[PDB]
């Protein structure tokens, strides 16, 4: 029902990042294989314990590394995200899909936990936009919507049909300090805290008054493992849980943000692009089931982050 | 507006068969390409006009037949259907998803016409049982179902973001005297109809009273046409239509045989394996956008049917 043994594969992207380091102090520096297509500069993750340059899409490589270290639990995190899956669309599908399909065979043939995350980016239009249920509407018109959709059902497919322990959840946007503000869709929250201890003034990509799920990275770091180590048997979904800790519009945040740095100001901006995509995307999503059936919990509402966000930006050094 | 030059992938399915005969006859021998893996002898499309062998997941050689004929329309037909699919569930993905990717690849590079067939087994347990939306819940237990909802997905995100012509409908349960029966989910409510001619008993593998959506070959044929050269304003939906002719349990059928072969008898001894999926589609579906989008119609009812199926299988001679 614990995790021993952890391979994390696409450790180096936003969650990875700081997901290795947490598991590692958990779990044992010796016991987290962190791995990734390709290695970067410094990188905490890469200069520290274990890690195994991995291509995810290769079955045969993939499957080697679970077995070098006997793993008893694998978090595929490997995929394209929004902003480079749009571009680089057939690329998106071959790495999201056959990355997965390959973990998932393995896990099949390991008897290993597969925990992949799934997004808001699941939801299409018409999803329902206030509290949208666990269960509902999934016609996405991203790349990456459609990856997270079919990956979804695949994951419940290993499952239902070969008993596969495979679980996930259905990120928000994620707000760290960890990694720095990469102009994707959700980023605006993050950039804000930046341009606020560096000027005292953010200009906004994002219209005044929307609103988005959104969670602080050691809230969704403990839901990925809460959830993988939840008692098997009130599972009633798997792929993916709907959770969230808050939603918000840019003007709340600098509310939140001015209650400590009274001199801060928010311009508005307006990139077409990624408006479309908040606007394609629900404002709140309903975390009953998750919170039912594994006991989701949270810890940082607006206020808690605002006030660690700007405490953890100035130990790094902005102001 | 119209198809004058039709590649079709997968000509020798249940589908494929009558379809390439049928649009032979309507647009000339010389302007439909039959295409599929493998041959057979016994098939009437190999032995009367142009037959390419494709495999479809080659995306260069796909290209090659599209090119050779100046193509305007690609009907892609190729895929492992619902119980060979349970058989061998990664030869499903691989063919279903690498084929229908190459297909898109294609229309998207040849501006053509891409008609992709869906299924009933696009539909989960949370699918509503009764009338079930166009815009409603797709969670399915089934490989081809996942193959299909991907495949939905995935085609609505060719036309959404390239513009190309992607349209399909959901297939009910299809009922046919050229294609011999056994094997798939659905085939009860065509060997039926040869045993009720043979002796007349039938042992049914489907409980007393389950409905399931059906339709008689030629009203689905029709559908294809009908969608394939509608105008495209009235649009809303695209990849694919809910389309229907009737609902019906075995019971049914059975009465409906009565009418014309009184003597007839109908044991039960269901499997699971297959109940079991029946159990998981919807009992009937709702045709409407259908209708209001590009004017759906059907012409054979469970009585029309049954007459037309009992003289065909007389003439090929059978008792």
Redesign the interface.
Known sequence: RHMKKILITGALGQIGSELTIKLRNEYGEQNVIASSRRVKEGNPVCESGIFEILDVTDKNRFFEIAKKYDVDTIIHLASLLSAVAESK??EA?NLN?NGL?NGL?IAKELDCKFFTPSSIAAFGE?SPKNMTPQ?????????YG?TK??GE??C??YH??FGVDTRGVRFPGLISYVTPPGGGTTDYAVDIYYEALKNKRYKSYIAEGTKMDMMYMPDALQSIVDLIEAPADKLIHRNAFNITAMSFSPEEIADSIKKYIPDFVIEYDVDPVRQSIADSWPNSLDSSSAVKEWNFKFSYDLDKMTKDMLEKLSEKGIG
Chains 1, 2 share one sequence.
């Open positions: 669309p057939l599908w899909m399909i065979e018409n269960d509902t509407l999934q016609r996405p018109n991203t790349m459609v959709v079919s059902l695949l419940d497919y239902s049909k």
